[PDB]
Enzyme design. Sequence first.
Site, PDB file in Angstrom:
ATOM      1  N   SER A  37      44.953  35.147  47.426  1.00 15.52           N
ATOM      2  CA  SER A  37      44.642  34.004  46.781  1.00 15.52           C
ATOM      3  C   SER A  37      44.897  32.700  47.368  1.00 15.52           C
ATOM      4  O   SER A  37      44.303  32.335  48.404  1.00 15.52           O
ATOM      5  CB  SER A  37      44.128  34.013  45.576  1.00 15.52           C
TER       6      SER A  37
ATOM      7  N   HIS B  78      40.880  40.565  40.789  1.00 15.08           N
ATOM      8  CA  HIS B  78      41.370  39.622  41.763  1.00 15.08           C
ATOM      9  C   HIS B  78      42.325  40.291  42.724  1.00 15.08           C
ATOM     10  O   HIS B  78      43.479  40.503  42.378  1.00 15.08           O
ATOM     11  CB  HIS B  78      42.065  38.446  41.082  1.00 15.08           C
TER      12      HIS B  78
ATOM     13  N   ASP C  10      35.175  39.335  41.907  1.00 14.64           N
ATOM     14  CA  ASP C  10      36.458  38.671  41.731  1.00 14.64           C
ATOM     15  C   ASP C  10      36.243  37.404  40.892  1.00 14.64           C
ATOM     16  O   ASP C  10      35.382  36.568  41.214  1.00 14.64           O
ATOM     17  CB  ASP C  10      37.087  38.344  43.100  1.00 14.64           C
TER      18      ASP C  10
END
Length: 463
Positions: free
Chosen positions: A171, A433, A406
């Site tokens: 991320s 994710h 995602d």
Amino acid sequence: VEWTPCRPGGALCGKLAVPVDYDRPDGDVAALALIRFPATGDKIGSLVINPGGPGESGIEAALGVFQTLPKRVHERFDLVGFDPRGVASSRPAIWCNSDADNDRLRAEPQVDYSREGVAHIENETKQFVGRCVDKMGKNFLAHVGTVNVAKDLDAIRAALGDDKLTYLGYSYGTRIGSAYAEEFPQRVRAMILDGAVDPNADPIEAELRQAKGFQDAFNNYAADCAKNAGCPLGADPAKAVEVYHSLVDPLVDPDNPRISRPARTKDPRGLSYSDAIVGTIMALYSPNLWQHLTDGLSELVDNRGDTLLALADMYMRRDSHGRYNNSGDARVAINCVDQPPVTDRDKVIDEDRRAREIAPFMSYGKFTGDAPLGTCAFWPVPPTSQPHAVSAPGLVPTVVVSTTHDPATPYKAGVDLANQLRGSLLTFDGTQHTVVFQGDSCIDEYVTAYLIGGTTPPSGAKC
């Protein structure tokens, strides 16, 4: 860095002082917390990880990663997690809100975008920014940005006795990766980046893509659910959004949208509208959490909201005694210095117009012609970085793992980041994710082969 055991493995912990300002290295000083799971075989170097967020703890992340780590990797690397500056156990840790400040916001429906409503939200934002400054001071806040996290990463790299860095980032951790690659490319041995952030994106168009991401995750969840007995969203997935609103909208007084009508819970708070939404958002991070979302929606049919409140608590990192960690406060602070904030009211008003159309499940009632500015439009210290295309020509090949659906960091960002890096894209088919070291044996083989032997997935590799 003097190492020591912890208060769960073979783990050692340590602190490492870095300068707060990297132009004033004889000035103020921060201390970063580190955890280290020694390698059990022939050691190549340290695998350094970052869980993302920002505001998420890498120390707490390494403890989790440790359990799902391929045996071959654990043989060859130290698993090292760190807490970025201002985050979790590092000192000083960003603080803005008391625990009571957090609950108080979360009890509001936060759904009134009339002028009065927007003034109310904007007023609460200002008191927040003020509370940040009062507790942290304008200096420390000016340097929590990623450009300075990247500099600490190289201090960390060197403090563990590695000539080059082996790095895994999820991320937001992707943004740390590409920042380190721009400033210390000659020090990157290897890099896996799962769930990409594209530092070249326009902030508003990214958010709209993220809204689209989550609407699409919701679509997928709802369709899965529709095949199941007793689905709380009904058997017809094209009507999921409306049914979904028939369940969450009664949590808001239909004659005055500032008034929460929370669903019954054993917890004293009950379930507010904003918590219902945040709970849904949390579950759509991972199909592992879809069962909980379905339980949550089922409870709402009975005017109960215990599971959604727990899911929203997970997202907000509130423990069972009502204590918050600093992930939320740190998240905002670090995001606010990573790029120029949007200050143009019209372009914020238009973003709300578009998001309502893209992600109806998140939107309450109609477009009102007004919308609040984000926290960062009021930040007292300037951005330390700016949207730009990653350029780090001599970087080793890196692997970018991107999931097709995602919702947090969409597939396209992954593609684009891989192009700027001119590295390998590895695709996961799924609705979640991130995926690396999270069960899937195919992803993990590719990643283990890369980490050990430098071998990249072939063009078009999918799992």
